[PDB]
Amino acid sequence: RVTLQEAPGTVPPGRLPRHREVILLADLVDVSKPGEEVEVTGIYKNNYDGNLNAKNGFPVFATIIEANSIKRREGNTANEGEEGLDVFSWTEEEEREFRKISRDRGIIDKIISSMAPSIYGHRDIKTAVACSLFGGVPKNVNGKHSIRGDINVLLLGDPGTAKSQILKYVEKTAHRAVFATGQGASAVGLTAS
Amino acid sequence: FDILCVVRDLVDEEADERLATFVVDSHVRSHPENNARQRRLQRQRKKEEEISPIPQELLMKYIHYART
Amino acid sequence: SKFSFGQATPRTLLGIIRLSQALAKLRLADMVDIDDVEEALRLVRVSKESLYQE
Amino acid sequence: SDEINELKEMVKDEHIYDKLVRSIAPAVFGHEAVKKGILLQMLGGVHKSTVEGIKLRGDINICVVGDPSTSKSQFLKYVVGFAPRSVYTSGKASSAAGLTAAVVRDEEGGDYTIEAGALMLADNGICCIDEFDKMDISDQVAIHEAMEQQTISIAKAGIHATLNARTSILAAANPVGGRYNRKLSLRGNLNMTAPIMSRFDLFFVILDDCNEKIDTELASHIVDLHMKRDEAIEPPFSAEQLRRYIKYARTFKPILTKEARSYLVEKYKELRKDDAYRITVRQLESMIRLSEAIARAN
Amino acid sequence: KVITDQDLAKIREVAAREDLYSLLARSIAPSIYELEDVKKGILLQLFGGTNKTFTKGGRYRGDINILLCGDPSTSKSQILQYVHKITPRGVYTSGKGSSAVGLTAYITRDVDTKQLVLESGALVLSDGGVCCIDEFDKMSDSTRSVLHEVMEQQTISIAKAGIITTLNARSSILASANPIGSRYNPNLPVTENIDLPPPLLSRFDLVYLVLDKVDEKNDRELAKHLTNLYDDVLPVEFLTMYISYAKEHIHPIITEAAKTELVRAYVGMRKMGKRITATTRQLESMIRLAEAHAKMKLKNVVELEDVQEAVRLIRSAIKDY
């Protein structure tokens, strides 16, 4: 069982959020995790609750949702124009062609071009972003030595130089992304609390 | 930080010329006014092809496949 | 100068008359003698100046 | 039917653009330069999103600077009482949220909850800040993303979210010194920094003159406001008329013609050349926004 | 538990009195000594200027805000207590004072019923009255923000705990202030001594500098008055009923002669100065004070005398302040 709550983005500003309870039966358990947006398809059902009647004074029933599918809406506000419960998954025909696109000789540079095409220049920034998106390979040497396998990028530029737009694009494109701003983040907001 | 990218804004008339042209063309392209679902998808594809050699959705799936 | 605790105010007058009234109460006399007022004045003076001047 | 006829009669007028500017905040006297900015802010600009989900701003931010007692607040008061959605606040906001959102948790177990601020409450409206130059450092920094990306990102203990802040800011500020000094530049007279200053589309400076003629004229008008009451104010278009036309204008989504496209590039070139640091790539989009707003007014 | 035709006739009889002004001024606070100007200003504040409901224009406040600032020796809390007693509606508060109810509307939980209730603060409960704030110097910055919002917009807006509401706070303010040190230094300006933002002390219609300069004659007179405490005057009930009647029924209006005198006085007060002697705020203060003076006479019109009295008080207030 999970307690669904209205997303802060949709709730009217300043008002309290409503919530409902969703029941996830086998094969749907652990698909959703705390702190994540989701799109739940299910059956709206009601049953008798004695305590609710006792507190309210009227014969009001209790309502729940019986989940039938879940779609992870977190960090995908710009992918709402897409079918399926997963927008980063592939058919058997889409990966028989991700393998033609990739034998061609200049994919390493048509990929860099396709990074935030609505930004005019900044080839180095786009190359760094592509490298970070694809990332390196982690390796545990003999089970004793751990070596990081991901690439970190820093953009240190002038005011109107299309940095935040690049960050927003990377948020759109990555499988799992979270956006944080300077003073809107805390030491335990990042990491764990 | 593996990569440091320093960005500078310098006034070069030729550089300002290209950037302004691109920005104005982009604003024109993104204007809202500029089967039904099939026609909408086709026009969106035509608009997207002008600036990106690879479709963005195909690119997302490709990146996920490569990382997996 | 900076040595003074604080310039006298009407509060000081009210305090002086209050002390004189209490002294008269101790004396058990209605009529507040000049002696009570003088003693109250001496008390206020020695409250602070007596030890500050040392 | 009758109102439509009124609307048609309004558009057919050839002075229409001038009449609307002269009909904004009739209470104030002789600040037509400011009024043009406010009218353009109400109409706004076209909001666009690219073919890859990158959002381009379409809201006009205005800053007003002037000496004390120069009808600065009178302009904000008119906007909040006229615009559909709006929120009047001050830089030194009393609430914990301030201009942006804050996280507040009820006693003991209760998990953290988001408390809306000024910029969130004015969503899709106009947020009027009475004293911009006195904002708190947390809001000063947090206002960076709200003004351009139109969101507020918060990641605190147990709660993380992106909150919509699609608002147009109309701020009023006092000079760093007691009065605006004509010798220094706008940068010197203001305590704001370059990144914020580039986020404002327009700037208006209101001075205080000691001319006898202007003093008598201003004093007369203020007194007549109380004496004649309504009779002292006769703008061409009443408040109901103006609010109807503005709603009609916003249904228009003007585009850029071929001739204007080339022309708009040349003007940015000239603006950049004279600068060489006020002007950035943002000013190019400001001219696109204002051009759309001016078109909407017509 | 432990108005009539006759009252109206008595009110007209007192109104017709030639020496009405000084009579009310003396009757406001009999026990205070030799503060005629302050009492006159407070009397004007009590009546309050006309309130304007405007179409095609914003609302114009008829309240009067007065700041009674000076040395601690003088009598300032006395005057606030008197005003509280006289006022038909109002509250008494001290900044940063837990005893006071609170200046701003705040959401709380009813202990008796365990429910959430929106409780209005002192400013909202003073709607239509005078809110006397005894200690204006020591105030929380948030309190000074809500005060700015009140004196500017005359409403308090609270948007917390799921509630978004606005409360009318059309209340005058009569605050008191003390110097940073043990006494007021004439050499330094009023702003430095007061320890208040220029944006805040610029909003008071009158600012009164009551200083305890040491003078043989003045101290002699004050001591004589105080010791003796161990020209008719009016009972407090009559004063409050008169004030309520005037504040509810009379609504003075400006005239062409008053319009000429106001313009001329404002221009003269500007031309005195480059240093800016007066601002457009002084014009609103003068018109409000003239309206209040007209109200006190129960007149429905503002004559040359009302505007002239208002300028004399405003000019004197600009004077030592």
Place this chain on the structure above:
DNA sequence: ATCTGCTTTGGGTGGGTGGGTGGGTTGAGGCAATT
């Protein structure tokens, strides 16, 4: 009219798919906002 059967106080020898607007209330420790 007689026989059969459940549940208290309040408390962990009912619990957390009953909650805290059904009462059991100090003590410690973590977090944001205030400084």
Place this chain on the structure above:
DNA sequence: AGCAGAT
């Protein structure tokens, strides 16, 4: 043990 129900 007092009260709530079925034969």
